[model samples]
Target chain A: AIATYNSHVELAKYLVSKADSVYLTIGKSTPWSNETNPPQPDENATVLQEVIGYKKATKVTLVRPSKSPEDDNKNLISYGNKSWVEVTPENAKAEGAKWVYLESSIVGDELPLGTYRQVGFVMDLVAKSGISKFNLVPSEVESTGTLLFFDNKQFQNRSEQTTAKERFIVEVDP
Target chain B: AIATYNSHVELAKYLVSKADSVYLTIGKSTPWSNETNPPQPDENATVLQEVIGYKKATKVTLVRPSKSPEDDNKNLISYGNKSWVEVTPENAKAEGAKWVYLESSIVGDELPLGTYRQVGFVMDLVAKSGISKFNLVPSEVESTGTLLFFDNKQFQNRSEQTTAKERFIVEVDP
Candidate 1:
């Protein structure tokens, strides 16, 4: 009971114009069937049908963090030990070699918040934040965006629990 | 990142003026301890301390229905069949009843969105309507609140899965 889509760029443009028919809940991991793939938990069937799954959101981009998550080099992505990033579109925009880049977009259906159609992002982006607890990168500083990560050794301090782990990486637009 | 405390009448006046610490999430039941006298599990441990329990929130009212829940007698509350209501101040003004009635309050420490301190309610009262999924009444015909149930009939509609079963029935405050 929390979703009117106030803004995560108006809820990531309604999760990219309902990319393949909405479900977005990504919690209670039994393999989250949505978020599109990787981050884990999508084999479906559990409490509330595995907390909602069957993943169909081909995409839903929105990354904007170069700082101000309580600051500490905000736009980051050292990927906990390299060579582990994939979302294709030819690696999306490949950013700096060490990680830290994004600014994506490809949700189609004429963009600009679709009058915020059928909005409901589980409390506006699953319990709110600069996109619910960030951790996804691959941006040439916003080339179709995707760099909301922030692991300054573990949120550097905002009381230490930024919440974000709903997992993401869907890339399915043929 | 959606909690600026828009209004639950300003989050019930800062939860009745901070009536014994705060940490409300209301989910993942397992005898949620903080809600006060539990149904089970609560020595203090498990899932957000067992999804926010140990009750303690004696009273914090609001009720105003009998219309606009798709209207089937909006402010109605007949109580499961005969007797099953428990939010008092002597039934908080029990209306036309054989059951449904509310509009209570007694949080303390002054009000008016209390400058929205510690704000964060998710989509502002969650998707804005039906008390963001009932279970916190104190309305007196639309003064901003409504709740009175016994729906053993299953959430009539609104997608038939209201999720309101973490239970509530505290009454502290000496």
Candidate 2:
């Protein structure tokens, strides 16, 4: 999930790291489809739903504070843990602005957004300085977690693309 | 522990309500003291010697869609579920904000952020709406939990006043 210290700051941070990474990625959940699906869904609509709602899909441009895109993610520090990573296309999807999951953890005919929270984060990896969609497959499990899509190639039809809408929560822990 | 489509959304919904009723609430697992703690901590910083390392403080404010000061928590949804409440703040402080927990069921500091993530949501419930901070509380045997601060407060000087910081997250569930 994407947590923020300042609404303006964090939102800006998200906009920065997630700007160019708004495309599709590998994910870990089934598309919630009924056998034999075809036709890619709308990028502006839910990633996998029967219908679209609220705002339409559009290229959400971010107001970057950095002069270059290379240095944006450097500002987003995790909680007290101090574990932060570069903003990858996959990480962007996990953070709530995109419709992708760049991990080959699972594979199936249908790939929806249900497998993750809108605020997805890189888990179990602390050794890497700059992390993105796993270039390699997960340790095992046949790498079914990746959910990459080049527009119409990710889904079967328009009905199963409603699972990608996202919202967030802001609170203090104590 | 409210597990669902998105814990972050659920928590923010609650904060919206609290903002309606309580101008703000004051709660601290580790009350900020001089020796034990500083006046205020940084954004997303955890308490000293706390486990889980995700402790943080939250400050929430309700605003009209245009970002103006408004009160609409009466119809606000909590848990991002179907329930709505009129949350209000009982008091405020010179250093930070606070709020009465929205649900009467929450008294223990061990608020479950979600099922297995071991994360929780906490906020100040100020004049703003939506969530303001998100993080897991430090594991302290003390009644509620330990209060946490971040860079703004983590590294402090005797003559300085740390600015209030916030961190928020969003989660979705089926």
Candidate 3:
């Protein structure tokens, strides 16, 4: 399950020098045949070209805000292409990937001080080819819990391809 | 804020013999003139006649499930029309309401035993007159914290009126 922390200090201490990571699975559409008993992406499915922090930040950032926040100054962290690493379909069959590794070193003093209700990462993906369909693996990372899709202004456990852009987020209560 | 409980046992203990409640506010469209500088529904806006638990339950129940769950047998609770109470525009202007008073008595021994990551209530609304528009008051209750709208299969802190039916949910972590 996603780790829960009581304060930014607690969460920051956990992440200060750790290489925590999250995984992703992209597909062409829902009911991914691979998501069933025998997991695998569709043949010749769209390939991912990039994964950026929410709103296209070039490099992953530790602090970012959501659509709304209790304190304008405090928000969740986000990952960018710099942290994304692709996992081939052959390996994804066993589990999943297009992994995000948070390798940045953070100082607790740099993070805002507050009792965070929920905290984690946000990101958006871009396909290498035409955008015929948008899909996400309906599974969770053994390390990070569940992967969520940003839809209708909220983070959900489902995937969508109708919007001009596709975004995702993961939050753990702290 | 919505109360959070670690286990159904803890939550049940808090609700076993208590009367908990939630509130609502409806309007004709976005930016209800009354939501700003001064709070109030639009003049002659839609009046609400009924409030039903998610999926239209006749009365509120504590064992309903959400769109998805860790265990199919367990789900969040919901409130129905039996728990709804109307507050005049005048009364709502001061704070907000179309109150939902959960008057049910829950027995802890009867509740499922599991650690709930989040728990609270779900509900939907219907207009008394024509459905020209759908709006919800955008404010939290002094007693209950913030109200949330159900959109794209997830609950959020915003209002919407596009779907044939409108739904809302409030959750808290224990």
Candidate 4:
């Protein structure tokens, strides 16, 4: 069964009652290949695995031409003769290459199942841009990549990703 | 010299120019003691170390009486005969005991210093309650725990912590 909530707290309550364990991951919303034709993943694949036919970039590193003093004393680690440039999605794209930075996966241990449960899984998530997403995949079905996808789509344009704000929740059961 | 920026990106730009390495930590805005007399820490101590005379709680675990089915299959690992309850700050406080959950510290490796820098430190932060805080401490002065404190004080009341919204930035040099 699938359910949705207006807030993350409400979703946690439901999980506290239904799940035995959860695997969590953070993701950023990608620009639609064609705004009129937003990419869609396989009904079975996790929203993050791939969108449309393209393999979604799981991790990204940004770089740019170095400037003295201002760019000095920063991440000077060199690779391929270029100093690594740490930056945001927008900044990275604007000043350098295409890359995405997402949080690593976090796993929760065995949990009770049903009304007899007594614990809640807690986490803090930050949305760098107004639009982002998070997934809560039950450990039991995690291998299948069937999971709940929370899409924060408060903004669309890259420029507005930092200005807009909205909130909502969603759930999926495999 | 201390400097402040309205956005984290701006701050990162400044750091990219000034720091050799950065240490980051996440924290929650604590309730002010006697609202009229908000707690204050030593001018030298980190904002998180302590507020007023009381030692600020660094980590917290929440628990509550178990209910069948709903509470079942959750965090059943038992301690002192009680099942561990995974919950949010507000939920934990409302249903069980006093506890605070903050992200662990993340240390950045050696970075370049000054305008010749080329990398920017990147991170994602989530504010469960409307009010939250983050610190960026330079590695050189981290031992002293004197750092930059970004206070997200969009809301004041515990109840409003989830409802209000605001944004701002701050910096400190030691």
Q: Between prediction 2 and prediction 4, which has the larger lDDT?
A: 2
Candidate 2, B61-136: lDDT as tens digits: 3211111234343344333212222223322222112222222112223232211111233333222234333322
Cand. 1 TM to true fold: 0.21
Tens digits of per-residue lDDT, candidate 3, B59-174, equal 22233223344433533343332122322223332322323223221112122221111112323333334422222222211122322322222211211211112233222231
The DockQ of each candidate is 0.02, 0.01, 0.03, 0.02
Q: Chain A TM-scores, all candidates?
A: 0.21, 0.21, 0.21, 0.24
How close to the true structure is residue B147 of candidate 4, measured as C-alpha lDDT?
33
Isolated chain B TM-score per model:
0.22, 0.22, 0.22, 0.23
> Candidate 2 or 3, higher DockQ?
3
Candidate 1: which stretches are off by over 4 Å? A1-15, A18-20, A25-52, A55-174, B1-59, B64-174
Each model's total of backbone clashes: 48, 86, 5, 46
Model 4 chain A TM-score equals 0.24
Predicted structure 3, TM vs. truth: 0.20
Question: What tens digits encode model 3's per-residue C-alpha lDDT throughout A1-174?
Answer: 543233432333233223222223222222223222223323332322122111221222233223344433442343332122322224332222222223221112222211111112323333334322223222211122222322212111211211121223222231
Each prediction's Cα RMSD?
A: 20.1, 20.3, 20.6, 20.5
Q: Which ten residues in a row have the lowest lDDT in candidate 3 chain A?
A: A154-163
